[PDB]
């Protein structure tokens, strides 16, 4: 069901510099969409990129692979949610060139702490605890940084499930404009 | 860039720059692709820089050591980047980079740990296999002592857990030579 | 389908225990060591001089709780004779050989067999080093022990363990496994 | 839906037999089966070392070292057990019916003997598969020698008619030396 | 399974067997034990067996035939619901003269069923030995019956269902019991 | 189960067929009424019947062993009766076939299946439709419906209330508290 | 499997070596594998006769008589067949790396050789698992008169050698005379 | 991975369209009916191509259906060009049937190959004269095997019964001797 | 594993089908009619003068998929040869029977099935009826061409098609089902 234009249809978006992240975030899709970012600044490295964000979010390292190629590369790459940006969605929408961050009207954007998982001795645990929270701290300190909200005040917000609208994600600091039709 | 996802690929188009992508857990399917691109590289300029991106959780030791063995043999410098996460044998690759030109994103993961294994039948057999994974550890840390200039008991001691640096903190290790600011 | 005698009802077995016969006639785990041990230690308790009779006819099994039965069988008073019946593998015929001397039996057509320890070892390289170690101290152990039982040198049976090896009843006798064969 | 028969002693039916020292083989043989019918086996010597024992087979075989264990009992106690085929003995299920004591080896005239070589497994290493092969060519001949000791028959014809399976009727098995007598109504 | 003895207990204290099920092995191992005890208790009392069966096992039925045979007893057969296939062989075989069923009761009559795999010599041994299986059920049914051997065989075919009357005008039971 | 529950009603003359009709549930039930007769030949019997249906020969077993038997078998619905249940509560002595308020009963054409040649396919097919007629004919007898009405109101899943029913003629009383 | 473009004709980068005469051998070894590299070498000897081919192993081994359709072609054909070991080569993985042409197997330094014994299983009747003995029994008779022809070691050292899973650095597997040179950066 | 090869007009090929090209066909696998039907379309197409040049098939299969190796083998005898038989790696059952099947002459195998001969096998369930039907067919088909195995190695019907009752393996040696191939090429 | 021939590029199936070929070579379902009838339709298309050669191996199938075959076959004006090559059996019988009168073949070693058709039927009494009455109805037409094509009688074909019947090459021209056996030149 991907048709072609005479390219698939992504392929002819990402000709015109636009990226879409339009699904869980793994490992496969961070490479691709790194490679992509990597391919858009060699063609033009002054020209905007568009990273279009429809997900729920994934692996958190996967979702950094994206992010600091994102703010490696010299040109702008603004990001726009389309449906829903959820968990490292949400925070690869937050991390688009500031002024250049959008939502359309009834696009959903959730934040929540990280989740994981830890098996084994009484040690190997407390390692992964720690790791964990190392990287929640990690993502509130640069979501500190994106949205001008303190670092308090983030891991309040995070704790649980927390939906936003457009519009809240914008007061919240997450978007810089709504985009309305 | 005909397609992005399945130079007509993405992957195709960035090795056409000498540019591969280890983006993926390491097995013998992935080695083999990147052993293939390496000696690819080589031939069509035995001079200039080849670029590994490493996005991995680690995998296969003898996998791994294929790419190590053939980025050793091959004549050009071959520039390791860690974006994302390098754990295990990601991290082993991550330090086998050209002296100078081993990097890592700022908020990239470098996690190191001891090898893992299984052995399984008669009281003779668990001890070849034993004997032979410590022998693999021994290897591992050797060539991660010659690399990053610690001491063989200093890595033995910190991969006996998982233990998980910052780019930074890699940097320091001698795992990487710089982490690159924005 | 375990009948029952009445003379007072008894299952078959329990009439066996009765008479001092314990049936050792399946694999070897905890549950069937345990069981096994609270045999024996009830047979010393009603008469700590009278001959207890262990019938084998196992696999073997855990060696651990092998063992649980072999240091009940030396801890107790009475002597406890035992007999192959069908065959006696592995942690199976270690039990067979540590009977009492001289009353350790096999029926003529029954089959002894011995080998290595069996296991396994999943996980980081340091723990397949411990699993080794203790599978490897393991093997020494029961070498040790089955050479005070048969006679034979610790390194004639390193070598004879090595691999299944599969005895008659006869060459368990000649081996010093078993004293002697029953014949009818 | 095993019955009970009440003499006020409470039994099973297999119970109630085994006071009239008859042993119901009436499944696969397997170690659980072996360490039941010998324990029986003993019992029934030290209730009466004399008087006959009848074991009734209706059995597809098992367990070759388990069929053992039934063997060398049977040939062990001072008791002769009779042996009386019902529907099938199979395998070593018809090894059995032969170890009756000589003379009371019996079948109806209805059920079915088959005999055929052992089967079994190996895997592994190649050195491995030699010992299990070895083992179990050596269990052949044991089987076999006792099969021609047991029938009359010679060592070299039981080999050959185990080659394949080979189904008797009662009065082949007869002929065979596998039993005595075919029991008439 | 009430109580009064369980209730197939209390029928077979008057000489009741109930064969109320698939006939396999254990099946088969209980219901000889049963007439081998009731022989034992009376030899000269009549046994009545009881048949509501599929049929099954071949061998475990003829354990259950080869036994009525033996035994000193005559063995009354009645079947009540269904006696198919070894279920109708066995109802065949009850003492002359005292085979019945109940009006309702459905007998169904087939060739036996099996398998074989492996070498082509495999499948010649295994298809030999159910094409005996099958000459030795039909002889024996031709000589409860009355019917020929080629009579047996054609109406074995294939699934034949009688109503307990056919059954009776077949040979396999001597009369249908009216309430 | 808290003598058992079931053994006590037993000893009082009460089978419960409480449960779909298979060969263990007729053998059972079978045997009862036997033990019954043998204790006394003239005093009613009482077959409760809470039950989906099932086994058609079974259920046979079953009605056949209740007309054989001398006393008279009272038959009570209670929940529900259906198929091969609603069968036997219709089997239950003239005059004493009853239901409770409540009670459901629902009759319809028996069902099977059949797989193979098409001779095959044929005899199954034969065979069920011999046995609907069957089923239909002793119906119509214990009902006073005729056969051609019983195949028209069980050619499909037909739900009776108990007044229904004994309008129908499957119950002679309803029996009000 | 990335694709590479010469100015449009098109490879996938594993036909881009075989263009150079480089097969990849880079898996468990059954016969959808051997076929491959069978008729890569067909291809390679018709393209060129003379000029060497490469075989880079990287396998855990496999099937045995798919490891010889390998090891018989490479003989047959007219090319020399430098073999590689990169990563690991085990069982007839191993067999094959020593079975390049003499003088033209390597390893690279890291690279591990293991050689064991043949594997195998064998169910069914006594006879059956007898002739499954023979046949794994005389195909590691064949697989040791090769492997001590390629080596120089005698057949009673490769027999003792192979017992149980033997693991050979590169230095070793050059030194056992598996391979001929280990490539040093 | 199965590669692709370029010719010099350039053409793109995956390596067994390139030896297809040369008359050579792989039999590589199990044999089934979808095999069955590509060999056949192989060597119905090379024959349309040249009726005169040697076809070659390469033979490394455990065997499989039967009637699926009939089908192979009828269409070798039925056209015209010689079909040389190369055995490498392994033929088992119908396999080396086929192997033998090839032109006399020109069937071989490598040193090290494997074939192994065995009588056919099957199954059957259900009524007694379904499975009488079955054996009596096996057995038929038994009976066509073995006598064209006859007819292709010189070896007696009575020998070929006997030799196949089991599992029997030989070496390409002894493939040879056995009439079941005509030379093993050395190296 | 379907091979590509260069004329544009064709896999071998479309090359053969330019030769006016159709290999029905597996299982016939739906899809597999669909595609036979396409491609009868083509070939119609391009000559409705020149013979179609229709190559049958094939263990049967749907019957309503087979009448798809049947009745393109019968309604387009090219004669169709059929030739069994392997098996046909039941509906691939059917098939091989349905060729142009005098273009009928099997190759001689060729095996020819013929059975009565196989079906299901599951719910309630008047269902199964229905399920009966069609597939005897289905019985009855397949069993009526059958007689017009081999000069059968009805009555005979339904007698020898009540089991399974195993036909050679030579007993299948015998009956009617092909008009030659093509012996090897
Ligand atoms: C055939 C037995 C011969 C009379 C003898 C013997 O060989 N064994 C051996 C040691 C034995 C032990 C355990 C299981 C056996 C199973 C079969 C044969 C001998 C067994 C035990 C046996 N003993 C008993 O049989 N005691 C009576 C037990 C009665 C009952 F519990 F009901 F079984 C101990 C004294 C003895 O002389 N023997
Ligand atoms: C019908 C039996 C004929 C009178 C006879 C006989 O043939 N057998 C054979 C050998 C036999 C043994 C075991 C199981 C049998 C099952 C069915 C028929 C004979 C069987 C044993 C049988 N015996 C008994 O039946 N003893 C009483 C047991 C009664 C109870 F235990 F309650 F079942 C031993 C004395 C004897 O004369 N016979
Ligand atoms: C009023 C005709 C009856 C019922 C008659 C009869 O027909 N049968 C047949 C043969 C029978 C046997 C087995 C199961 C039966 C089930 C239902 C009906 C008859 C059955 C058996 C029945 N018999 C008994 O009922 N004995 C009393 C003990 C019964 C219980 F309490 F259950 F133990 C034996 C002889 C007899 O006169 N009949
Ligand atoms: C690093 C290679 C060194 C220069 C050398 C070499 O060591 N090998 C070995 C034998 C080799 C073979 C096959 C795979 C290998 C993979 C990694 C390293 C060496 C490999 C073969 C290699 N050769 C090539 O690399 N040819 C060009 C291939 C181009 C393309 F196909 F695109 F990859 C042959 C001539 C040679 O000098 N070497
Ligand atoms: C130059 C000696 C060879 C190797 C010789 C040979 O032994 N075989 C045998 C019969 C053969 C057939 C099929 C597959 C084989 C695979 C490996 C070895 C021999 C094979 C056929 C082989 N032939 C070819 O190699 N033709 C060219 C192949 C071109 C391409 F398709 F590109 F692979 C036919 C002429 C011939 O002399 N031989
Ligand atoms: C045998 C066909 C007879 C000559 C005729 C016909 O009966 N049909 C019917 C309606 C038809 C339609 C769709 C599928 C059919 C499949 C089999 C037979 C008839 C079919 C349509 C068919 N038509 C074509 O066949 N056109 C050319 C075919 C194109 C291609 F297949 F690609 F070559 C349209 C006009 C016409 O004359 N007919
Ligand atoms: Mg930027
Ligand atoms: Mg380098
Ligand atoms: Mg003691
Ligand atoms: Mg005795
Ligand atoms: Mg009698
Ligand atoms: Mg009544
Ligand atoms: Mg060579
Ligand atoms: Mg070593
Ligand atoms: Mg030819
Ligand atoms: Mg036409």
């Given at each position: 069901?991907?048709?072609?234009?005479?390219?698939?249809?992504?392929?002819?978006?990402?000709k015109?510099?636009?990226?879409?992240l339009?699904?869980?975030?793994?490992?496969?899709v961070?490479?691709?969409i790194?490679?992509?970012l990597l391919?858009?600044?060699?063609?033009?490295?002054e020209?905007?990129?568009?990273?279009?964000?429809?997900?729920?979010?994934?692996?958190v390292?996967?979702?950094?692979?994206?992010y600091d190629?994102?703010?490696?590369?010299?040109?702008?790459?603004?990001?726009?949610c389309?449906?829903?940006?959820?968990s490292?969605?949400?925070?690869?929408?937050?991390?688009?060139?500031?002024?250049?961050?959008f939502?359309?009207?009834?696009?959903?954007?959730?934040?929540?702490?990280?989740?994981?998982?830890?098996?084994?001795?009484?040690?190997?645990?407390?390692?992964?605890?720690?790791?964990?929270?190392?990287?929640?701290?990690?993502?509130?300190?640069?979501?500190?940084?994106?949205?001008?909200?303190?670092?308090?005040?983030?891991?309040?917000?995070?704790?649980?499930?927390?939906?936003?609208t457009?519009?809240?994600?914008?007061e919240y600091?997450?978007?810089?404009?709504?985009?309305?039709?």
């Amino acid at each position: 069901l991907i048709p072609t234009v005479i390219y698939d249809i992504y392929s002819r978006l990402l000709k015109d510099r636009i990226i879409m992240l339009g699904s869980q975030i793994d490992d496969n899709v961070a490479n691709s969409i790194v490679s992509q970012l990597l391919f858009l600044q060699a063609q033009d490295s002054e020209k905007d990129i568009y990273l279009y964000i429809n997900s729920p979010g994934g692996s958190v390292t996967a979702g950094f692979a994206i992010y600091d190629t994102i703010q490696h590369i010299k040109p702008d790459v603004q990001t726009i949610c389309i449906g829903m940006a959820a968990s490292m969605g949400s925070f690869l929408l937050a991390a688009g060139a500031k002024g250049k961050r959008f939502a359309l009207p009834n696009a959903e954007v959730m934040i929540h702490q990280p989740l994981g998982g830890a098996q084994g001795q009484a040690t190997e645990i407390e390692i992964a605890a720690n790791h964990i929270l190392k990287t929640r701290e990690k993502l509130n300190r640069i979501l500190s940084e994106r949205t001008g909200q303190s670092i308090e005040k983030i891991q309040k917000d995070t704790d649980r499930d927390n939906f936003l609208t457009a519009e809240e994600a914008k007061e919240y600091g997450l978007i810089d404009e709504v985009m309305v039709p």
